[PDB]
Design a binder for this molecule. Structure first.
Ligand SMILES: NC(=O)Nc1sc(-c2ccccc2)cc1C(N)=O
Length: 261
């Protein structure tokens, strides 16, 4: 093993406006010259394992292609700062967009988005690679598709700092997207995240257990409580099965989403 990713020189990037924060990151709009519109993910000063995890994600995402996976252009080191350089996708995070468009996103639109997500994720399953952070915030909207005769187009972004390097406190915050087996490893975890993401999508960007304290989210998992029903219901319940070996394959998930729309 030896990572593979493009090294970007600090001269080749321009840092523009702050977009928000990811896990141990600050995220900015930028420009990449040899000019590409890009996103810059500046890793906070942090333990070395966080840094290694960041690089492991850049390497992973630098070696996969898909219609519905966002590009990773490289990594730029700017003195003590490590910066992942990624695709700017026009309309930003899906969760933010859904909350703003709450009430007038039709179920048929959500079905297309779901089918796109599933096919991205079936490709990673085929490659036996784990994403580890499927949630609406990591789904970026390239086309709105709300206009008559158009259809939406999403891209799944990089998972950022790997799950294994995060604190237990951080993993709790990711409930219900976090697979229960990860609270105390496989491609199975993304079936849970997918399920949790489908609920998030069905509820116009509100995910379940958002009004719950960390202790309550933990307790929900400990008592293996069942998450609400969106009929994507069968599918979502299948994905949101605590036992990883009972979650259906993306081949099945995708075949099912097709013969639904
Ligand atoms: N590749 C990638 O992740 N692109 C991202 S991340 C992001 C973002 C992240 C955290 C808070 C708010 C926005 C926006 C965009 C974008 N518009 O493409």
């Amino acid at each position: 093993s030896q990572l593979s990713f493009h090294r970007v020189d600090q001269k080749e990037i321009t840092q523009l406006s702050h977009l928000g924060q990811g896990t141990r990151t600050n995220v900015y709009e930028g420009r990449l010259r040899v000019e590409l519109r890009v996103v810059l993910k500046v890793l906070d000063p942090s333990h070395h394992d966080i840094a290694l995890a960041f690089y492991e994600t850049a390497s992973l995402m630098s070696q996969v292609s898909h219609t519905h996976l966002a590009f990773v252009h490289g990594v730029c080191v700017r003195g003590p700062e490590n910066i992942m350089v990624t695709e700017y996708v026009e309309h930003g995070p899906l969760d933010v967009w859904l909350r703003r468009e709450r009430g007038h996103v039709p179920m048929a639109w959500k079905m297309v988005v779901a089918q796109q997500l599933a096919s991205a994720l079936s490709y990673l399953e085929n490659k036996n690679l784990v994403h580890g952070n499927v949630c609406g915030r990591n789904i970026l909207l390239a086309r709105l598709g709300l206009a008559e005769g158009t259809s939406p187009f999403i891209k799944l972004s990089d998972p950022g700092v790997g799950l294994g390097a995060l604190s237990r406190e951080e993993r709790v915050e990711r409930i219900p997207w976090l697979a229960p087996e990860c609270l105390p490893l496989s491609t199975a975890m993304d079936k849970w995240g997918f399920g949790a993401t489908l609920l998030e999508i069905c509820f116009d960007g509100e995910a379940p257990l958002q009004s719950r304290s960390p202790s309550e989210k933990e307790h929900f998992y400990q008592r293996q409580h069942r998450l609400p029903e969106p009929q994507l219901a069968t599918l979502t319940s299948q994905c949101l099965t605590y036992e990883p070996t009972q979650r259906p394959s993306f081949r099945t998930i995708l075949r099912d989403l097709t013969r639904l729309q």
